[PDB]
Design a protein around this ligand. Sequence first.
Ligand code: ZN
Ligand code: ZN
Ligand code: ZN
Lengths: 176, 176, 176
Amino acid sequence: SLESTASHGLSFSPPLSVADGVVSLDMDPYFCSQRVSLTSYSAEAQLMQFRWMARGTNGSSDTIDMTVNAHCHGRRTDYMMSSTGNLTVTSNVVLLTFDLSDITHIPSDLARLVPSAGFQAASFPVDVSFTRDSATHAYQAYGVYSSSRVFTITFPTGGDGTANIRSLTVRTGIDT
Amino acid sequence: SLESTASHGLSFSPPLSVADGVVSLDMDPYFCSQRVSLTSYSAEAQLMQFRWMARGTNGSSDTIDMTVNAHCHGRRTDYMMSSTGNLTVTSNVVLLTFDLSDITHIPSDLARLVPSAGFQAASFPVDVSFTRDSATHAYQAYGVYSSSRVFTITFPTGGDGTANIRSLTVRTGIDT
Amino acid sequence: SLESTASHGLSFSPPLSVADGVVSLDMDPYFCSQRVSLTSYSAEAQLMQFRWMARGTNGSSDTIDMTVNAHCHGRRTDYMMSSTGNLTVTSNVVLLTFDLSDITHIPSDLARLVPSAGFQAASFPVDVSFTRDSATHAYQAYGVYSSSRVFTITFPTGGDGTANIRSLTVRTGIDT
Ligand SMILES: [Zn+2]
Ligand SMILES: [Zn+2]
Ligand SMILES: [Zn+2]
């Protein structure tokens, strides 16, 4: 009966789509694009600069202002942070929390400061250094997202008891 | 004769595939995914921790235990390694070999510690530092895969003759 | 009238293409490939080594030879550069320009030293360090492409007036 193998037609599953008999690959421009062939991102990179007030959440109840540059290039966002002021610590380890609500400025493309579900699944490396009693301490530390808006880094304070650390730098990156 | 331009039908070459008249893009979830549009990886990142006994293969016949964190995020795996113990070196340059067979633990997703054929094609940068006679030496070094399971890094030892280096750190990453 | 929903046929928009009833995804091998599913790059990585004469363009009218290793892996190119000689600086900030025309050698795949339009859109982080009067200065600096062949980095010189800096290292990367 009268049909050909073509009669029933083809359906196209995302990221493939058809419109008006024209079949396309839908491309997130932060990840990929076409220049005849499928290649890497076309979206413009940006370098965001803002202040992030980080909060001590264990081994500190203090806060510390961080000057942040976030270099967003494709779906990678790299953070370079430097403190102003001292952070008061109370123990040999401190947890420092970075919640998007504590950024001033607040970039328009806030999506670039939010990790992917995949990336959120694990602890991630963070380079930390700071000065305490005129010595530099520097550590390969780790951060972890507790939710899509909030990560916390854990690092040693270079001593015990109450002390004030300064010149805290934080370097890390996330996949968004 | 009786056919239309549709009669002979369309064939779909990988990573495109058809099943039941539904055309799909097959996506490696470590590389890409769809959220309407084609975007970056959906697979969960992981932070693997294990001990890697590295072997001196020139300028040393010794071995050294490395504490390794491997942060696997998409098809990128970044290594952060720190030694325990001393490595005995005999020359001004040492070659230190990292073979998957010498990892204890042995993560289930061992595929994350294997570089792609493309990445294997070239030497890759490795940051190395260690202490020798109370001085720190630190170098931009290079590694190269001799096979898919084995890479070797080459770095200066900071002197000559027989000596023992300690606090060896290795930072590098691979594309898998 | 006589047509079916198949009569008019399907058109395929780049990076999808049809030839001889076979529908393909065209893949830039520096970005992606297929191993049944769509995955990451298949092109061979390379480690290019060349000399780059950088030019002082503000706070210096001098030039400085840089020994460059460019690790090209997919569409990421990472630069590791170390100077030979001194650079004469005249101010507390220097601008150092890296134009492809000043590379000797001149790799065949010069496309790997050219950033994407997207990446070019923003300033990018550059790690800089150098020695001046027997002290090391080290900074998170920034570079910016003024055109597809030319970027300039800006960094502090660690003092004022006329001076000569040495052991300048530059580490950064670009998306191509
Ligand atoms: Zn039917
Ligand atoms: Zn026929
Ligand atoms: Zn018609």
